């Protein structure tokens, strides 16, 4: 079965970026759309739009970016999988690539960047590392 | 004091119920949390609650050889 929705979305992005796809579509959820919005605001993907389809369904479509021939997303790895969840405090969030990357943190104030959570003095679930 | 909440797994003693107190304990090395439960014998003076109810107990002085908790609130009954 499919039991990691965030991991599925990240794997879709990774596989499309390795395949040089212009955009990747997937079944949409609010958590997926929030993660895509953080990626857009971090500058890793061009855009992310949710098209409400029939039968109470929705498609999240993400436009990917490529810089100098290579993909913009150098790496994107799930951290807190369903089989082992990871929660960190404000001073324990892992830094990604010395800070040149992003650790996606789902905090009580929403899903933000690791640097945003550090500025806010907050912690939460470390869901992904994107560099 | 100290108050615990859990289901009633046994009631077949007079003025006595066993309460299943669930807790989450994190593995010291592998970081995952495991569901752990302790059976706590509680005092049921009026023999009110039956097995399967979700109750709250509070710590008190010993009542018997193994009973040092007393029923303070029945919050939900079985179906």
């Amino acid at each position: 079965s499919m039991q990691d929705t965030v991991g599925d979305m990240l794997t879709r992005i990774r596989n499309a970026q390795m395949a040089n796809k212009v955009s990747v579509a997937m079944p949409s959820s609010k958590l997926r759309k929030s993660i895509a919005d953080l990626l857009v605001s971090e500058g890793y993907v061009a855009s992310a739009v949710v098209n409400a389809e029939e039968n109470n369904k929705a498609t999240l479509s993400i436009e990917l970016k490529y810089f100098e021939g290579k993909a913009v997303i150098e790496t994107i790895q799930r951290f807190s999988r369903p089989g082992l969840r990871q929660h960190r405090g404000k001073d324990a969030i892992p830094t990604v690539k010395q800070g040149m990357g992003v650790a996606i943190v789902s905090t009580s104030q929403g899903i933000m960047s690791d640097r945003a959570a550090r500025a806010a003095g907050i912690g939460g679930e470390v869901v992904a590392f994107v560099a | 004091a100290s108050v615990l909440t859990g289901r009633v797994v046994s009631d077949k003693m007079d003025k006595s119920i066993t309460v299943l107190i669930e807790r989450l304990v994190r593995h010291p090395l592998y970081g995952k949390q495991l569901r752990r439960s302790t059976k706590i014998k509680a005092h049921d003076e009026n023999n009110v609650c039956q097995q399967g109810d979700l109750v709250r107990i509070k710590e008190t002085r010993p009542i018997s050889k193994t009973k040092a908790w007393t029923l303070v609130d029945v919050v939900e009954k079985v179906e």
């Binding site: 089989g83 082992l84 | 593995h27 592998y30 970081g31 995952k32 495991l34």
Partner: protein
């Protein structure tokens, strides 16, 4: 090895036993030579290596090597035994300390004298 499997079962580090059981985790050990003999080494080497079968205070009856050139050991000689196996001698896992109790030092040793219990020539 999933996280659930590791928590359920775990990892196991088996513990290697000591290569010198007869010492019983002691630096040295005292014994009496129940036999002083010679033996031939393993396949590449050939010699008459000097060995003593010695019964230690720890209750073991083990074989130890008499290093150096020449020795005074014989039956009922009280010797001190340390660890360290002889590579080409099967079943010899100890060395006899020369100059300790009754094993004399090497007579005309000059270079590595402390390794053979030889006093400093004056």
């Amino acid at each position: 090895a999933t996280t659930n499997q590791l928590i359920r079962k775990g990892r196991k580090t088996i513990k290697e036993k000591s290569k010198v059981p007869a010492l019983q985790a002691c630096p040295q050990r005292r014994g009496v030579c129940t036999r002083v003999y010679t033996t031939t080494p393993k396949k590449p080497n050939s010699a008459m290596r000097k060995v003593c079968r010695v019964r230690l205070t720890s209750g073991y009856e083990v074989s130890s090597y008499i290093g150096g050139e020449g020795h005074n050991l014989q039956e009922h000689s009280v010797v001190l035994i340390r660890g360290g196996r002889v590579k080409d001698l099967p079943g010899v896992r100890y060395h006899t300390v020369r100059g300790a109790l009754d094993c004399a030092g090497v007579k005309d040793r000059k270079q590595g004298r402390s390794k053979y219990g030889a006093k400093k020539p004056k």
